[PDB]
Design a protein around this ligand. Structure first.
Ligand SMILES: Nc1ncnc2c1ncn2[C@@H]1O[C@H](COP(=O)(O)O)[C@@H](OP(=O)(O)O)[C@H]1O
Length: 256
């Protein structure tokens, strides 16, 4: 097809929860749009200074009304944080999908989903291991190498609670998490007009996404498959072993 000049503004809002293929989608959207897509990885590896900003935003975000003077100030900060990006994925953004829709009225919405039990297992391996899981200590040790402290975990946990709209959440309760997962995905599809939404299941690949966005399928390029829990386990172990990101960064080409 013809090459056209795309606007550098949020064009795609993905409401997908972590461990539903957000990093692969991040990579895919960057392949399509040739501009950056937001993701927790963007925070970890490029903008750790954004952590306090997202934490602040979440703290104020209960005073959001579906436009008040308070809402406008919050929307202004949200827009600021996302300046220069063409899409959003992953925590902490996914919980803000309704607000992002208002801020970017011409953006389309995605929902990445998968088997709930596969999701739970993936979550326990990477994002939210149980309190008494020994692997939790390995995750934390490796993350320290990345310069991530307790404020990172606060943001991750609090942005997840925001997504689920829970004041308190028993992170060690599998059944609770599974229920929140189903309820969340259910609510996105009830909330977003079907015209404006595409639901993507893991494995769907380029075709439904590119049709939804009216772009050509990227020629010669397979749809990204990155950020498996096996790969995160390896990254954690290698960070612990080498004690720096730069010593091992060439070993994880498209992942980070
Ligand atoms: N193209 C693809 N096909 C199938 N699974 C994919 C995929 N891209 C990513 N995934 C899976 O999605 C999860 C990563 O999601 P996220 O980037 O949001 O954290 C991983 O699941 P597993 O942990 O079960 O391996 C990863 O294997």
């Amino acid at each position: 097809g013809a090459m056209i000049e795309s606007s550098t503004t949020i064009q795609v809002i993905s409401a997908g929860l972590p461990r539903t293929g957000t990093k692969s989608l991040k990579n895919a959207l960057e392949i399509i749009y040739h501009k950056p897509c937001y993701h927790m990885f963007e925070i970890i590896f490029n903008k750790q200074s954004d952590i306090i900003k997202w934490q602040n935003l979440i703290h104020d975000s209960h005073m959001i009304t579906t436009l008040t003077t308070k809402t406008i100030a919050i929307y202004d900060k949200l827009k600021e944080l996302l300046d220069g990006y063409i899409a959003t994925t992953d925590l902490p953004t996914c919980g803000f999908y309704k607000d992002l829709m208002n801020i970017y009225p011409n953006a389309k919405v995605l929902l990445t989903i998968r088997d709930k039990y596969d999701w739970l297992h993936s979550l326990r391996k990477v994002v939210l291991p149980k309190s008494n899981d020994p692997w939790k200590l390995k995750i934390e040790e490796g993350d320290k190498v990345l310069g991530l402290n307790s404020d990172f975990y606060k943001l991750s946990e609090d942005s997840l609670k925001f997504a689920f709209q829970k004041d308190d959440l028993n992170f060690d309760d599998d059944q609770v998490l599974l229920e929140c997962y189903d309820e969340y995905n259910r609510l996105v599809q009830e909330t977003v007009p079907s015209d404006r939404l595409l639901v993507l299941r893991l494995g769907d690949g380029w075709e439904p996404l590119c049709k939804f966005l009216n772009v050509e399928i990227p020629n010669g390029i397979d749809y990204p498959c990155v950020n498996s829990h096996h790969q995160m386990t390896q990254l954690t172990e290698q960070l612990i072993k080498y004690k720096s990101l730069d010593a091992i960064i060439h070993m994880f080409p498209d992942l980070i």
